[PDB]
Amino acid sequence: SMSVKKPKRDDSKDLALCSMILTEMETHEDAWPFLLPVNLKLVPGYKKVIKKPMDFSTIREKLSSGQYPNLETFALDVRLVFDNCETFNEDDSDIGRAGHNMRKYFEKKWTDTFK
Numbered sequence: 001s002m003s004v005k006k007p008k009r010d011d012s013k014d015l016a017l018c019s020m021i022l023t024e025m026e027t028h029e030d031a032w033p034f035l036l037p038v039n040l041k042l043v044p045g046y047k048k049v050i051k052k053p054m055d056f057s058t059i060r061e062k063l064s065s066g067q068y069p070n071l072e073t074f075a076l077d078v079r080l081v082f083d084n085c086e087t088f089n090e091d092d093s094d095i096g097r098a099g100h101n102m103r104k105y106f107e108k109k110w111t112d113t114f115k
Contacts, residue, residue, distance in 0.1 A: 004083040014071040019063060021109050025078070026056055028105060030098040034081050052086060054083055072115065 025031060037055045040047045059077050068074045085099030 011071070015063075017113055018071055018074045018088070019066070020058060021113065022063060023048065024109060025102065025106060026060070028102060030101045031056065033085065033095045033098050036086065045058075046088065050084050052080060052084075054084060056081070075110060079103070082106075 026035070034056050036044050036057050038050070038053055040053070046053070054077050059074070061083075062068060062077065063074065068077075082099050082103040085095065089096040089099065091097070091100070
């Protein structure tokens with residue numbers, strides 16, 4: 001509350017560390033469905049169904065231009081990528097499986113780096 005603060009968690013490396021995580025996700029062999037924004041002209045249903053599209057290139061540009069206020073808003077957009085993927089793709093599809101694999105990979109790196 002006013003003039004009563006918990007001890008200061010060191011967040012000075014968060015930007016560098018989120019960038020490293022994102023590099024690892026970018027270079028994963030199963031990243032290919034997520035590297036670029038879904039083409040809303042060429043994929044029927046996407047625009048109407050997926051209210052907030054997100055992809056790794058969009059996260060990278062947001063990261064690089066100070067559009068994440070803290071490490072939690074960064075994790076929310078990464079998870080959005082995988083939540084969108086599960087909304088639109090069957091579990092038993094190459095893309096559906098890719099999304100599960102990547103979400104697992106992410107959540108481990110997240111825990112090991114920050115928890």
